[PDB]
Amino acid sequence: RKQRIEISRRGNAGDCLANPAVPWGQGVEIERALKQVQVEGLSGNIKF
Amino acid sequence: TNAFCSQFSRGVYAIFGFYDKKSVNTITSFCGTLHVSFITPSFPTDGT
């Protein structure tokens, strides 16, 4: 949100078994976010 | 999973195919659930 990217094109109804499967591109930007975020938890330094 | 579901929709009485050590659990679970029969030349599942 600090980067102000749009998180979701559509709120509901996506189908998993679609042939051929349509990967939503924004998902990638989620993957990156989760990967790039670092925080202090119960484990120690949390970094991926 | 996709292929299997396509076959199921097609209305097959049995399914002959190969699987991998990465794919074995999908096949075993889905065939044990939908009671569709599976015939394979590949290595034997561990257990029953």
Structural summary, described in words:
The first copy, chain A, contains one helix and two strands, in the order H-E-E. The first copy, chain A, has one helix at residues 26-36, and strands at residues 39-40, 45-46. Chain A is α+β, with helices and mostly antiparallel strands and 48 residues long. The first copy, chain A, is 23% helix and 8% strand. The first copy, chain A, has a two-stranded antiparallel sheet with strand order 1-2. Chain A binds chain B through residues 17, 19, 21, and chain B through 1-2, 5-6. Chain A: It comes from Rattus norvegicus.
Distance between the amino and carboxyl termini of chain A: 20 Å
| Silhouette of chain A | elongated
Largest sheet of chain A: 2 strands, antiparallel
The chain pair forming the largest interface, with residue counts per chain, is: A-B, 3 and 4 residues
Counting DSSP E segments of at least 2 residues, the number of strands of chain A comes to: 2
Q: Classify the secondary structure makeup of chain A into a structural class.
A: alpha+beta
Q: Strands of the largest sheet of chain A, in order across it?
A: 1-2
Query: What is the count of DSSP helices of chain A, taking H or I runs of 4+ residues?
Result: 1
Compute the CA-based radius of gyration of chain A. Answer: 15 Å
Strand content of chain A: 5-15%
Write down the secondary-structure element order of chain A.
Answer: HEE
Oligomer: part of a larger assembly
Helical residues, percent of chain A: 10-25%
